[PDB]
UniProtKB/Swiss-Prot annotation:
EC number: 5.2.1.8
Organism (species): Homo sapiens (Human)
Function: Immunophilin protein with PPIase and co-chaperone activities. Component of steroid receptors heterocomplexes through interaction with heat-shock protein 90 (HSP90). May play a role in the intracellular trafficking of heterooligomeric forms of steroid hormone receptors between cytoplasm and nuclear compartments. The isomerase activity controls neuronal growth cones via regulation of TRPC1 channel opening. Also acts as a regulator of microtubule dynamics by inhibiting MAPT/TAU ability to promote microtubule assembly. May have a protective role against oxidative stress in mitochondria.
GO terms of biological process kind: androgen receptor signaling pathway; chaperone-mediated protein folding; copper ion transport; embryo implantation; male sex differentiation; negative regulation of microtubule polymerization; negative regulation of microtubule polymerization or depolymerization; negative regulation of neuron projection development
Gene expressing this chain: FKBP4
Post-translational modification note: Phosphorylation by CK2 results in loss of HSP90 binding activity.
Alphabetized GO MF terms: ATP binding; copper-dependent protein binding; FK506 binding; GTP binding; heat shock protein binding; nuclear glucocorticoid receptor binding; peptidyl-prolyl cis-trans isomerase activity; phosphoprotein binding
A Gene Ontology cellular-component term: mitochondrion
The protein, known as: Peptidyl-prolyl cis-trans isomerase FKBP4
Key words, A-Z: Acetylation, Cell projection, Chaperone, Cytoplasm, Cytoskeleton, Isomerase, Isopeptide bond, Methylation, Microtubule, Mitochondrion, Nucleus, Phosphoprotein, Repeat, Rotamase, TPR repeat, Ubl conjugation
Subcellular location: Cytoplasm, Cytosol; Mitochondrion; Nucleus; Cytoplasm, Cytoskeleton
Activity control: Inhibited by FK506.
Tissue: Widely expressed.
Length: 237
């Protein structure tokens, strides 16, 4: 008796909100999410729960790190929200099932509480220096490499004041001479054609100790960019 939230609307994932969450944001593909859950077969046989865990269960959303029904359901949740989802085998473990605990072709029921979620860290050192919040996923899978000619539309903010708004075509590895910070170039390298995202850059992945005088940006400034990767051509290697 829940609401069907399957894309195909094939009743593959039904959801009933037990407690409403707060705010209006919902995690998006790539965001790191934190939840507590309990899973049961349709007859009531409990086969797993994280409620004993010293810490919440976390994974990156929409990266297939969990069954389909989960990537689907959690993207429809708000922080604080508690819901129950019944998932058909197609969105769970299908025919193959999952040994001991879950038989072939089993419909599953999960109780899920979303505690928190945050943007994806794109830095190689995982130091939180470049955080992305995807607004609209692109569609292509391929990404620009060093040397690629990319076409982007961007808006850069410092303390929410807009300081740069341009549409430009440029070569990854040459953005510096066009007043783009290295970290933005690094972030573009992780985007797909058509992607619309907001990227948060700490000083060391921005203009760092130098700042950018003509944009009224001082040394050690954090920056936020909202951008669109329109198209690109990869370079040879």
């Amino acid at each position: 008796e829940g609401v069907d939230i399957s894309p195909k609307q094939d009743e593959g994932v039904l959801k009933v909100i037990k407690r409403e969450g707060t705010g209006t944001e919902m995690p998006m593909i790539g965001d790191r999410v934190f939840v507590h859950y309990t899973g049961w077969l349709l007859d009531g046989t409990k086969f797993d729960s994280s409620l004993d865990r010293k810490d919440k269960f976390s994974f990156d959303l929409g990266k297939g790190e969990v069954i389909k029904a989960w990537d689907i359901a959690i993207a429809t949740m708000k922080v604080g929200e508690v819901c129950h989802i019944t998932c058909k085998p197609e969105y769970a473990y299908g025919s193959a099932g999952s040994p001991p605990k879950i038989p072939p072709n089993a419909t599953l029921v999960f109780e899920v509480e979303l505690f928190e979620f945050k943007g994806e860290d794109l830095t190689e050192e995982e130091d939180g220096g470049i955080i992305r919040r995807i607004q609209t996923r692109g569609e292509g899978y391929a990404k620009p490499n060093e040397g690629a000619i990319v076409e982007v539309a961007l808006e850069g903010y410092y303390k929410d004041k807009l300081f740069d708004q341009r549409e430009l075509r440029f070569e990854i590895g040459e953005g510096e001479n066009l007043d783009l910070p290295y970290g933005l170039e690094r972030a573009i390298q992780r985007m797909e054609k058509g992607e619309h995202s907001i990227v948060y850059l700490k000083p060391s992945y921005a203009f760092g100790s130098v700042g950018k005088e003509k944009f009224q940006i001082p040394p050690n400034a954090e920056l936020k960019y909202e951008l669109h990767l329109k198209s690109f051509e990869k370079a040879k290697e």
